[PDB]
Amino acid sequence: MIYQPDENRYHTMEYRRCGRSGVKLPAISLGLWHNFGDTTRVENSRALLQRAFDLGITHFDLANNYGPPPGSAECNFGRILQEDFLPWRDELIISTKAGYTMWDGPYGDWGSRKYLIASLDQSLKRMGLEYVDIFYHHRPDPETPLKETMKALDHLVRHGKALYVGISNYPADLARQAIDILEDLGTPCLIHQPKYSLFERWVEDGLLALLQEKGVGSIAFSPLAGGQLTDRYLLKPEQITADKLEKVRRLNELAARRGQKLSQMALAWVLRNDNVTSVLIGASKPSQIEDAVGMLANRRFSAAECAEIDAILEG
Numbered sequence: 001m002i003y004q005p006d007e008n009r010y011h012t013m014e015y016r017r018c019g020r021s022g023v024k025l026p027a028i029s030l031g032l033w034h035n036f037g038d039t040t041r042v043e044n045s046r047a048l049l050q051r052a053f054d055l056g057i058t059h060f061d062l063a064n065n066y067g068p069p070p071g072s073a074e075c076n077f078g079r080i081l082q083e084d085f086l087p088w089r090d091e092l093i094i095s096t097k098a099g100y101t102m103w104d105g106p107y108g109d110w111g112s113r114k115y116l117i118a119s120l121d122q123s124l125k126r127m128g129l130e131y132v133d134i135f136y137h138h139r140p141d142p143e144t145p146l147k148e149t150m151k152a153l154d155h156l157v158r159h160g161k162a163l164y165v166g167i168s169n170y171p172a173d174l175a176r177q178a179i180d181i182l183e184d185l186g187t188p189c190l191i192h193q194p195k196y197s198l199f200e201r202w203v204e205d206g207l208l209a210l211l212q213e214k215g216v217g218s219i220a221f222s223p224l225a226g227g228q229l230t231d232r233y234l235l236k237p238e239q240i241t242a243d244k245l246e247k248v249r250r251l252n253e254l255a256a257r258r259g260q261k262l263s264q265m266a267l268a269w270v271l272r273n274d275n276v277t278s279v280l281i282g283a284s285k286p287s288q289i290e291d292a293v294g295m296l297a298n299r300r301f302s303a304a305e306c307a308e309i310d311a312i313l314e315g
């Protein structure tokens, strides 16, 4: 059938300003890391994107190597965009990235100007776009001068292939250097995409304070620790360790006292200090997107609740 976005999509969703910029992101964003490749059904991928936009999720996050196979999430997103979302493309924030392994050899990974420009050209072709809203350097490249990588980002914005740029997985010291280089170049860093959840709190050691200084936004990836902070395990160590399973059980009892699912409490917790712009979820079914949006109704934490959480995590 012909897709018609829900007319009340902007009524419930909360939009949050992304650092000091003109961009407001939905409090909940959707990532295409899993369930958008050739190994899942396009019927399901389409249903996820339509349910997300109907609930006011305007930001879809991709990367060149998302699938599997690499590049298939960008192709499938490109097809669904052409078929169902073209009249509303200017209502969407689409992102992509380059920095991890995409193709074989010395120019298909890392941070060279060659890789970033060739990869974004590939990404725009797979997605059928003139530009992405945000282009990221996917991870640090310690062996390439940071200035070359940042100058490639500045070039792609000046020559209209990206509206804004970002960095992902950069530690606080490297994030400072990257932000200052981009500011001097005249293309200020819009955003940082770090891993952040109850089980991964490294950004609280300086990065969030630095981004707030510098007026740079942030979007937490793996906010459910890849699905550990859910109902899923309520087992191989890769799935969950014994100590983490005991923490999940105790965190779920606290979520129950609050009248919400563990997943909802875990997402709410990431935004508790109003110093993270958005939470980037993964989803295999539309009910998981509905669950995430349902977190907005119950995302306040008291001093006592934060102490309760820290005590569970200390065990």
Ligand SMILES: NC(=O)C1=CN([C@@H]2O[C@H](COP(=O)(O)OP(=O)(O)OC[C@H]3O[C@@H](n4cnc5c(N)ncnc54)[C@H](OP(=O)(O)O)[C@@H]3O)[C@@H](O)[C@H]2O)C=CC1
Pocket (backbone or CB within 6 Å): 030, 031, 032, 033, 034, 061, 062, 138, 168, 169, 193, 220, 221, 222, 223, 224, 225, 226, 227, 230, 231, 232, 263, 280, 281, 282, 283, 284, 285, 287, 288, 291, 292
């Ligand atoms: N910059 C970077 O280096 C990286 C970026 N990313 C980005 O961040 C996004 C988030 O990563 P991801 O770790 O997937 O996201 P989450 O941590 O939100 O976990 C998502 C997965 O957990 C399960 N899940 C989600 N909600 C629920 C729920 N309510 N009940 C039960 N299970 C649930 C689903 O798995 P199932 O199949 O079991 O239902 C889903 O695929 C990615 O989509 C991607 O765009 C991710 C990794 C690397």
Ligand SMILES: [Cl-]
Pocket (backbone or CB within 6 Å): 089, 129, 130, 131, 132
């Ligand atoms: Cl476009």
